[PDB]
């Protein structure tokens, strides 16, 4: 029974590491790509906006997407809520990359201790992502977002614009991060047996 126990624990640990890497990839992708919200058929102008970057059309029956915004210059970010959401998603990315670094501790430190360390780090990343996703809709009152979407758009209200793949992927990232946090906790308490 003990060898099956060890084999299952090792396999589930490897799978947990793989899914942690996948969630880190997801976190990086949702942080970078500006496809959180986007235009619709009834929108006055086309385009999209992410956490800090955003592209908007000129409005002459073509693409002509003028793009502006950069996290390395907070002056270009439309709103303080957008700044806070971008900062929180960045903090979540830093935390999950910190766990991926802490994978190295398995050589030396106790396996249960390392599992608990990444359990707490992944949980904190999940809270950071949750805070970012709650704070990001707060900034839809900004003048640029109102110009892009319409007058009906407002705080905590899509209006004419629609959620795109990055926002729902961030929600999926929250779910995956919380799940991996509990998985790490159970693995850490399982290694001691």
């Amino acid at each position: 029974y003990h060898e099956h126990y060890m084999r299952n624990s090792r396999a589930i640990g490897v799978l947990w590491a793989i899914f942690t890497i996948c969630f880190a990839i997801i976190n990086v992708v949702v942080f970078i790509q500006p496809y959180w919200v986007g235009d619709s058929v009834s929108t006055p102008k086309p385009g999209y906006f992410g956490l800090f970057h955003y592209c908007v059309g000129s409005g002459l029956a073509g693409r002509e997407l003028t793009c502006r915004g950069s996290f390395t210059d907070f002056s270009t970010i439309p709103s303080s809520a957008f700044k806070a959401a971008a900062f929180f998603v960045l903090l979540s990315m830093v935390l999950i990359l910190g766990c991926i670094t802490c994978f190295s501790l398995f050589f030396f430190c106790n396996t249960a201790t390392v599992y608990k360390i990444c359990a707490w780090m992944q949980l904190l990343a999940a809270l950071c992502l949750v805070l970012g996703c709650m704070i990001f809709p707060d900034g839809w009152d900004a003048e640029t977002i109102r110009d892009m979407c319409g007058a009906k758009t407002g705080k905590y209200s899509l209006g004419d614009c629609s959620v795109r793949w990055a926002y729902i992927l961030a929600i999926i990232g929250i779910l995956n991060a919380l799940i991996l946090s509990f998985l790490a906790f159970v693995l850490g308490n399982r290694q001691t047996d």
């Binding site: 793949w165 729902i168 999926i172 995956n176 509990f182 159970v186 693995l187 399982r190």
Partner: protein
């Protein structure tokens, strides 16, 4: 460009469901004593 995002959200939700199902299978393998 058609400004309809249906297949995009569908594939995103499908990939997310696959990942989440794998992690729930991880919980299953753990909690199955």
């Amino acid at each position: 460009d058609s400004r309809d995002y249906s297949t995009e959200l569908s594939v995103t939700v499908a990939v997310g469901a696959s990942l989440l199902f794998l992690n729930i299978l991880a919980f299953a393998a753990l909690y199955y004593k």
